[PDB]
Design a binder for this molecule. Sequence first.
Ligand SMILES: CC(C)CCNC(=O)[C@@H](CC1CCCCC1)NC(=O)N[C@@H](CCCCN)C(=O)O
Ligand SMILES: [Zn+2]
Ligand SMILES: [Zn+2]
Ligand SMILES: [Zn+2]
Length: 305
Amino acid sequence: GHSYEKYNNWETIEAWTKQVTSENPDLISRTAIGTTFLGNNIYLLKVGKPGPNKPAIFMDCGIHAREWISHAFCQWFVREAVLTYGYESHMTEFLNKLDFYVLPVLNIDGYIYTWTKNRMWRKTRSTNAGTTCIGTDPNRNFDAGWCTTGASTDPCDETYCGSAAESEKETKALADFIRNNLSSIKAYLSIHSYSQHIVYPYSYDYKLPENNAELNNLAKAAVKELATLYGTKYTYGPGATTLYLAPGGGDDWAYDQGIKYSFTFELRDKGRYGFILPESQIQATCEETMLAIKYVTNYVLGHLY
Ligand SMILES: CC(C)CCNC(=O)[C@@H](CC1CCCCC1)NC(=O)N[C@@H](CCCCN)C(=O)O
Ligand SMILES: [Zn+2]
Ligand SMILES: [Zn+2]
Ligand SMILES: [Zn+2]
């Protein structure tokens, strides 16, 4: 009983990844990039019409377990791509020229835990030495100025860096895929919630990126496109300046690998509902974010490297 306008559990999402690929074989192809701590398969969807020497964009959802709207957006991106292809001028051009590597749920173990035991869970579900405290923050487990100021050495903390960089199977499976497809990946997008922010490097240290002027102007125009629908106000700028010091992030790591277009999207809202955003707000949040994602996609095509 799947629905794009409702929050679906992992059993429903897994059944959807198989069915959406079978219903649309010419547009979507499904593969398993790895396994989680509990043993669940990390599924990845390649969206677009196949072809040779195609550039790609990587998009992940659900790094943090409680951010339910992030998981819901990845499903809506696939929904639009199969319904508007051949009917919408821009989406048709995007899928024909580019490939979309969509990872619907990264932290699967944590997401099952939010449906069964604790709704407010953030980290993974891995064991730690010398304590009964469980979990490691995946957005603090990447090899980009790992476990410095902003990340915690305490396993009982929500911002736990881990025993080592890429100590989690979920963090390694994501990083290995990017390394194996570095020459093709031109953009990295990380869907999260909440605050209504568009974050670009750097977060591990107080420093501006090489193409800071370009990333500032691109985020500015992407903010405007989202606002045209429901008037949703979004803020932008680099991580350490706008937010806080968050070392060992997926967006910061991707940038240091060569992906000059790296972004972190924080969805609805500002604090009224927070992580527990209602089902009645899914279609509104997904449609506005689509306009911002489509604008970033359009820019990347015109500035291929
Ligand atoms: C309580 C305290 C420990 C903060 C925990 N943070 C979060 O739960 C979320 C959402 C939000 C919670 C309320 C304050 C504003 C942020 N924020 C979030 O996940 N932020 C990203 C920032 C991404 C920066 C790009 N790498 C992260 O810390 O991974
Ligand atoms: Zn997050
Ligand atoms: Zn639509
Ligand atoms: Zn230009």
